[PDB]
Structures are given as C-alpha cells and as structure tokens.
C-alpha cells in the first residue's frame, strides 16, 4: 500500500481558498483530456460562472458542445448547441459502452472523485504523476499499466497526462506536473463547490465564537458569583 504524500496545496490552510486561475486551467485540462472517457454528471456549465469563467465565456464553452434535446413535433430527438443550464456531456451512452471502450473498465464520474478517495487530490496528483515501469517480478496484462498508487498497482487507464498534452490559454508551460496540479485543483472544486464559502463562514464563526464565548462565560459567571462567593455558617444550639 503506497499512500500519497501531502502536497502543499494553496487551499490546504484553514482559511485558505482555492486559487481560481488553477481551477480555470484545470477545467481546460478536464475538458480537453479527461472528458473523452470521464463524465461529470453533477457539474453544469452555469456552475463555472463567477468561479473561473464569465457568463459569456461559459456560454461559448457550452456552445462548443452539441447536446441531445427532447422530442420534436414529429417525435424525433435532435442535436442542439449546449447551454449554461446543460450539464457536462457524457462520453458514453451507458456504462457498458464505457467498459467496452476501455478494455472492460468503467472510467468513473469525476464530480466526486476527490471526495470519494482516501487521500483526495494528493492521491489524484500522485496517481497522475506516478506511472513507472513495473518492478522486477511484476507482469501486467496488456491494456494495464503499473501505477504504485492505484490499489493493486495495475490500472486500466493509460497515462493521460504528459508534457505539452494541451496548451494553456494564459501561456503556462503545460508540463505534466503543472497539468496534474491544475486538474487536481479543478477536481477539488468539482467535489466541494462550497469550499471557499465554507472557509469564509468558518472565519466568521471563529470570530463570533471568540467574541460570544467570553461574553456568555461572563454572563454565566456574573449570575453565578452570588453562589461562588457565598459564605456559610453553622450555629447549632
């Protein structure tokens, strides 16, 4: 069992938010590398507005895809440009076509992949960057790839990321580790899209507790001082 290391993410800190430029670059990584085999059923285009894209940019990104739309007057199903309210396209009509396309393996939905793994984005980063040669004595069937971080160390996913696998709009070199960090930030947002709000609320709650708890403690002790300074005398006959 090779457990993932702890990487110093920008969002690891207690009040530390996600870097939203990394979320944007990570959407570009998902939408250009992962999406051909992974779905994100619970993330729609509208969700990316005010997070890593403007509404106009996200409407054009939805326009880039075609989505099936419900029955016509004649009763046929048609293809229409995507919309903000549309969820991310699914690469495969059903799980069986997904398994057929990927040598029997179903590639998981990535809406909750960070939350649904022990080790989270650390695990995903180490998995994406951790493809090595199989060690002496280890042989994998064809269509399987040695990854020391995958349970069993035999994964059906070929190494997806590499240097210059995509181009980044802000011009970053797209080194493999850069691409992995960006996509892992995006996956952390896709699992927990309340992360930044949750931590801002946590900061406010810590301030409010640091005010109220001393104050309620003073209220309790003001009322109780009557009992706590009380003196008793016994004067029997």
């Amino acid at each position: 069992e090779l457990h993932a290391p702890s990487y110093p993410w920008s969002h690891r800190g207690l009040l530390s938010s996600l870097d939203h430029t990394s979320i944007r670059r990570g959407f570009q990584v998902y939408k250009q590398v992962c999406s051909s085999c992974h779905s994100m059923d619970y993330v729609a285009y509208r969700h990316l507005v005010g997070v890593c894209y403007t509404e106009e940019e996200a409407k054009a990104l939805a326009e880039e895809v075609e989505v099936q739309d419900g029955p016509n007057e004649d009763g046929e199903m048609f293809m229409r440009p995507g919309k903000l309210s549309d969820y991310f396209p699914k690469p495969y009509p059903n799980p069986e076509a997904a398994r057929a396309a990927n040598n029997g393996a179903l590639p998981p939905d990535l809406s909750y992949i960070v939350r649904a793994r022990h080790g989270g984005e650390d695990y995903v980063f180490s998995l994406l960057t951790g493809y090595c040669e199989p060690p002496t004595g280890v042989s994998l069937r064809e269509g399987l790839y040695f990854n020391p971080y995958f349970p069993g160390q035999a994964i059906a996913m070929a190494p997806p990321i590499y240097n210059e696998v995509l181009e980044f709009d802000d011009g970053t070199p797209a080194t493999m580790s850069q691409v992995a960090k960006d996509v892992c930030t995006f996956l952390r947002w896709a699992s927990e899209p309340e992360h930044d709000h949750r931590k801002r609320m946590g900061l406010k709650m810590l301030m409010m507790m640091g005010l109220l708890l001393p104050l309620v403690y003073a209220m309790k002790r003001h009322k109780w001082s009557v009992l706590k300074s009380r003196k008793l005398a016994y004067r029997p006959p």
Binding site: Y42, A116, R117, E192, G202, M209, Y217, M219
Partner: protein
Amino acid sequence: MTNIRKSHPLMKIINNAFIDLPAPSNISSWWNFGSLLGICLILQILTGLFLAMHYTSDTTTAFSSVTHICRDVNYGWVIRYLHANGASMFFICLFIHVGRGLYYGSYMFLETWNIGVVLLFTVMATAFMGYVLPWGQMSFWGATVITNLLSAIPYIGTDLVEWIWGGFSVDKATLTRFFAFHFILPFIITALAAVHLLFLHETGSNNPTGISSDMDKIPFHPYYTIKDILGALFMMLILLILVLFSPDLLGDPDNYTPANPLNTPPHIKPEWYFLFAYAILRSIPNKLGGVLALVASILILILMPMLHTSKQRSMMFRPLSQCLFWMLVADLITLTWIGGQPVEHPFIIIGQLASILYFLIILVLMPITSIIENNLLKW
C-alpha cells in the same frame, strides 16, 4: 391575583420543568450533556426536515437528490453536513451522558435510566436508517451487513430479514421504508425524552458527590439556563468547526460513490459510533453468539443498578472503581479502533481481549472492587 407562570396549566408545567425546578447547586459540566442531547435532537429534526424538503427516497434519485441538496439548494451543503455532524455530536453527547450516569451512579434512578436505555436504542436505529438514505456504497453495504446479521436468529431470521427488506435483498423498498422510519422515529424519541424528564423530575438530579442535595437546591432558571446556554454554545463551536473546517472528518469517502450491489467496498465498517459494538460482534466466531453479544453490550446498561455493590452512589470517593471506569472507557476506545480495522492479525486477538474485558469489567471487576472498597471503609 396569581402569577400566571405558576397558575397557567401549560406555564405551570414549563415552570416546574425549567424555571422553578430545584436543582443541585454543584452539578458539574457533565450534567450539561442532557441539555445538549435535547438540543442535538432539535437540530436533527430541524435540518432533517429541511433535507426532507429536497430529498427523494427512490433509489434512482436518492444519491442525486443529496448531490442536488449540497450543490444547488441554497445553503443546502450547510444543512446537510450540519445534519451529518450533528448525528456525530448526538452520539458523542450520548456516550458522555451514559458515562456520567455510570460514573456517578445515576442509574439508581431506575425509571429514567431504563427510559434512557430505550432512547439509546431508538437514536441508534434512527442514525442507522438515516445513513442508508444517501444510497452511497457504504449506505448500501452497511445496510446489507447489519440487516443480514438478523438471519442468525433461530427459525425466523430469514423471514424477518426479508420482511424488513421487503424483498430478496436491500433494495428500493428498503430505502423508502427506511426514509419513512427515519422521519417518524425522532418524534417518538421526543416523546420518550419527555417521559424521561418526567421520571427524572420525580427525584431531581443526582450530583457528583452522590449525596442527596435537598438542603442545597437552587432554582433552575437563572443558574442552569445560563450554564446550559454556555454549554450549548461550546457544543455549537465544536459542531461548526466540524461542519466548516473538516466536513468529512468522521465520514467515509466511499459514500460519495453511488451504491453498487455488484461491487463491494474493500472495507465495510458502520459509522464510528457503532464500531465498539461492531468489534464485539466481530470478536465472536459464532453468528448468533456474536449478535447476542452485540445486543448484550447495550442491554447490560439495564443491569447496572443490580450490579451496584458499593455503599456509596457515585465514583467520587472510590479510587479503585474510578480506575476500573477509566479502564472501561479505554476498552471502549480500543473496541472502536478495532472495529475500524480489518479482521486480521493482530486486531483479532486484541478485539477478543477487549470484548472479554468490557463484560468482565462491568459484570465482575466493578462489583468485586466495590465490595473490596466497602470493606476498606469498614462497612
């Protein structure tokens, strides 16, 4: 003329329960966890009802309904993880509350102690059936293991498990009826808590000395309303630290995966507040003996008044029994840790020794040690 607080029939009940109730002047912070429990209950009813405004118990939509609650419902992630970590806080407060009852001999209040045992069972059933509702991998397979445990029952085990399922396995009917029971049960818990307080107020609270405190009673309202408010604020602090800084600390990542009856998780554990029992049942090789031990580990709370062999009520003046009490708490911690672990060497022998030790403490060591303490005090 009258004081309507004392004369009005409803306000008279309220006045006698929380305002003019004579309370011991020395009950410690450990006596706060009653008021925390009733607060947790209210919180669970409040957030759950708001979850039930969006949740749907069909297996095709339950996991999706919860994702919708946490992603699109306004502040639905707040309500959801407040509910989950409030279940965890409920059980923390329950364990501390029962530990206080054990340590101070509060079980000598027979009726309220026995109602408390009933309450413990009902809260456990509610939490168990609620955890299935998200229909994650852990939801499904924990329901599977825990319900198929009941097949160990002689002659009617399979029939009763299938009747609880409403089918050949844990499936759609089980999820919908678990939602219905999970909705209704906390209100029965509310009624039982009211009966519980009715039985408690017959004598009033016990105190840390274990000595009757009637010569030093203070009114409940100004003192313990403010003290219980401070305790509630501290509890809220811990709960909100969980909800806002580590939402997933006490949960399991595999419940963010939708239930897969074809694939089972490598580890199928209950929630943390079941692990001590899951250890005990897993310690015994026999299916039915294991289930009987997992039930006796909570039914044995009914035996404490009959096991009391000390001349004193509480543990305040009995060092040897304090030693045994803290050994009992340590054994419960090790049972929780063992239940979170695989059934393999060395956790098996450790779980066996811990499971033996729990019963050997409650049933044997604690009585004999109280008798020894009795003689050391020459009575």
